[PDB]
Amino acid sequence: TNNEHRLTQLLSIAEECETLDRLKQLVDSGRIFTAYNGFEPSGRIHIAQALITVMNTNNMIECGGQMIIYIADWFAKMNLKMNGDINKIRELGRYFIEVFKACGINLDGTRFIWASEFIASNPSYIERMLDIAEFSTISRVKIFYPCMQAADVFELVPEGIDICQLGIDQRKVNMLAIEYANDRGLKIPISLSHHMLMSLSGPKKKMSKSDPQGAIFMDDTEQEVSEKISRAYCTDETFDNPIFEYIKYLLLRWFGTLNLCGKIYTDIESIQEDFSSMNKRELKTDVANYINTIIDLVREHFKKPELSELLSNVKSYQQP
Amino acid sequence: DHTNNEHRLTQLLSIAEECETLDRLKQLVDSGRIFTAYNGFEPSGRIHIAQALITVMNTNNMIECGGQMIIYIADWFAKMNLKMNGDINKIRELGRYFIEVFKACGINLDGTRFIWASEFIASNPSYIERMLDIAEFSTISRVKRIFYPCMQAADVFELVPEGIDICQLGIDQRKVNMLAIEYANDRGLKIPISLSHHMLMSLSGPKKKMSKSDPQGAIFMDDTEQEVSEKISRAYCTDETFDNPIFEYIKYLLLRWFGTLNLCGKIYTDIESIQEDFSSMNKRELKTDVANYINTIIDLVREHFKKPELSELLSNVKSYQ
Ligand SMILES: N[C@H](CO)Cc1ccc(O)cc1
Numbered sequence: 229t230n231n232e233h234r235l236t237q238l239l240s241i242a243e244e245c246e247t248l249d250r251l252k253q254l255v256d257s258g259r260i261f262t263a264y265n266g267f268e269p270s271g272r273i274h275i276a277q278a279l280i281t282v283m284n285t286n287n288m289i290e291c292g293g294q295m296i297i298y299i300a301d302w303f304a305k306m307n308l309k310m311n312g313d314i315n316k317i318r319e320l321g322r323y324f325i326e327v328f329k330a331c332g333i334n335l336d337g338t339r340f341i342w343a344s345e346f347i348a349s350n351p352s353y354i355e356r357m358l359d360i361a362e363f364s365t366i367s368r369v370k371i372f373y374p375c376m377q378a379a380d381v382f383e384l385v386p387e388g389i390d391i392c393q394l395g396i397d398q399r400k401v402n403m404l405a406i407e408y409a410n411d412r413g414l415k416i417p418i419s420l421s422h423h424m425l426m427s428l429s430g431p432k433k434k435m436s437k438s439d440p441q442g443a444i445f446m447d448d449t450e451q452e453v454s455e456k457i458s459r460a461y462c463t464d465e466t467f468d469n470p471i472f473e474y475i476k477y478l479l480l481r482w483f484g485t486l487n488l489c490g491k492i493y494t495d496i497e498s499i500q501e502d503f504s505s506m507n508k509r510e511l512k513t514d515v516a517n518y519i520n521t522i523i524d525l526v527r528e529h530f531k532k533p534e535l536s537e538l539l540s541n542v543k544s545y546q547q548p
Numbered sequence: 549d550h551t552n553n554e555h556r557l558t559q560l561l562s563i564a565e566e567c568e569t570l571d572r573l574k575q576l577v578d579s580g581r582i583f584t585a586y587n588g589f590e591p592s593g594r595i596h597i598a599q600a601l602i603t604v605m606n607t608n609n610m611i612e613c614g615g616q617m618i619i620y621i622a623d624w625f626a627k628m629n630l631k632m633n634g635d636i637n638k639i640r641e642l643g644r645y646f647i648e649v650f651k652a653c654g655i656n657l658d659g660t661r662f663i664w665a666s667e668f669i670a671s672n673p674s675y676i677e678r679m680l681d682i683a684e685f686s687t688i689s690r691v692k693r694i695f696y697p698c699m700q701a702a703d704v705f706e707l708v709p710e711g712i713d714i715c716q717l718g719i720d721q722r723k724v725n726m727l728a729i730e731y732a733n734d735r736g737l738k739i740p741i742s743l744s745h746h747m748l749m750s751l752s753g754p755k756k757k758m759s760k761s762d763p764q765g766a767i768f769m770d771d772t773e774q775e776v777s778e779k780i781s782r783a784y785c786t787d788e789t790f791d792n793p794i795f796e797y798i799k800y801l802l803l804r805w806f807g808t809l810n811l812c813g814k815i816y817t818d819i820e821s822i823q824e825d826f827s828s829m830n831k832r833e834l835k836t837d838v839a840n841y842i843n844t845i846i847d848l849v850r851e852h853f854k855k856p857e858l859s860e861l862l863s864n865v866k867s868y869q
Pocket residue numbers: 265266267268298300303377380394398
């Protein structure tokens with residue numbers, strides 16, 4: 229039954245999973261397994277990315293796994309982020325790492341790998357890219373970005389990563405990796421994808437466009453968080469409601485217990501039932517207070533004198 | 549006048565056995581603009597005297613003709629190919645060894661620039677993208693009817709921003725340059741020019757192949773004076789110039805390197821006279837002179853590695869044996 233719990237846990241983080249079957253076998257085998265997540269450093273880190281990465285990582289470990297955090301600095305450069313400056317990209321990568329630390333990521337079962345350094349040390353990684361690109365091309369016969377990332381799950385570790393833990397918006401990549409693995413008789417990577425937090429501006433709004441307002445960043449001050457929550461789209465229904473989304477995907481999971489509008493909640497079911505009748509101004513006040521408590525971990529972490537250099541550089545890049 | 553450009557064109561062509569179109573090379577030379585050339589190699593435990601001298605001679609000629617040489621140290625590829633069992637530290641150490649040998653033999657550093665693959669790949673994402681794009685071209689070409697070639701082919705396009713003008717490699721690597729040329733035509737890019745040099749035959753025979761199987765088939769920059777004498781003494785040698793490795797060493801290495809050769813009691817300054825007198829030369833006495841001239845060249849390296857600053861490199865390379 230212990231393997232049943234471990235299984236329900238790992239599945240609690242995902243909105244989608246490539247065959248629960250394959251995941252069930254891995255959990256049942258009872259053997260140490262590996263999972264990974266990657267990101268391209270950028271000017272600022274969304275609260276969603278920071279918290280979800282930390283919760284998922286800490287969960288993998290507790291469930292008997294090892295986590296690999298892939299810092300795709302090389303790819304960020306290739307995608308011209310930070311106008312291609314690798315030194316700025318790397319500082320940003322370190323900033324992200326420090327944010328994960330401040331938030332409690334479990335370093336005992338977590339390893340950080342940098343793309344630029346990994347690529348220079350493992351030619352097979354690039355070879356894997358070529359082979360996947362060949363598979364893809366020949367397939368469509370009857371863009372490389374996908375093939376390049378698809379190689380990650382097979383090369384980050386000798387036997388190949390067991391679980392690819394990414395956002396649901398990365399679906400196409402892990403699907404290719406699975407197609408490829410089957411056509412090459414390799415171990416099939418297990419996909420564990422999480423929900424993509426919606427914009428605070430509402431369903432009619434996009435994302436990353438006018439993003440400053442549409443999302444909370446780990447560098448936002450207390451006043452900025454409160455103002456972004458005040459402006460956020462919010463109706464009396466839970467569907468397409470960013471306030472309900474932040475509560476469900478971030479706050480309840482992070483804190484376990486929430487005191488909302490004078491009532492204590494320990495499960496999303498009860499919050500959903502009372503949602504329509506909650507005074508929304510009071511709810512927003514509580515939501516912003518809980519969010520600010522989380523970000524305070526980062527604010528306090530970066531007060532350490534040893535991180536002043538990092539902090540100053542990050543701010544200058546028109547970032548935190 | 550145009551005469552200077554004629555000499556420049558003629559000098560550049562003298563280093564090659566094959567040239568992908570004289571037309572493209574003439575235009576480049578006539579343009580009068582500074583141009584770039586590159587040569588690449590994977591570090592190895594030992595370095596053939598052929599590679600050492602030819603790299604130095606070709607490099608110095610390129611520069612003398614108004615060009616800039618890029619020497620690409622393929623350490624990354626050496627590891628991928630498992631040289632030294634994949635140990636990157638030994639590979640780079642050997643890479644430094646090769647460089648000190650080029651320097652000992654007088655390569656012109658003022659017009660030469662070294663670039664290591666491991667570092668280049670980590671700093672230039674476009675390089676890898678080029679490999680992928682070339683691989684797609686090559687795959688679609690077949691489907692319209694092994695990635696190692698597509699990988700090396702990217703070199704001429706990425707080593708420098710505007711792409712390298714001249715690919716200067718041994719003729720045994722013509723397939724890679726030809727791929728690059730086809731690729732370049734399809735994608736409308738500057739067409740790379742190849743200037744491929746002759747591959748020296750094995751001292752063991754015209755049919756024998758180069759391999760760690762018989763280290764006697766070639767002279768290495770680490771061979772001792774007694775060792776070269778023995779290797780030359782035992783080398784295959786008939787009275788004809790064809791299928792003769794002794795003749796090849798004289799033609800492609802000695803005459804070009806020294807300009808004047810005293811062989812079997814006679815002075816030679818051109819290959820035709822050597823060829824006409826070859827059959828009647830006492831071969832045992834010829835081998836003596838050939839071995840002596842070769843040892844004079846290697847003495848440059850032996851002396852170079854006596855410097856105290858290189859005692860470290862020396863010891864390391866020696867241990868890798
Ligand atoms: N490409 C993603 C965001 O742009 C980040 C990423 C995700 C997974 C990887 O294996 C690598 C990078």
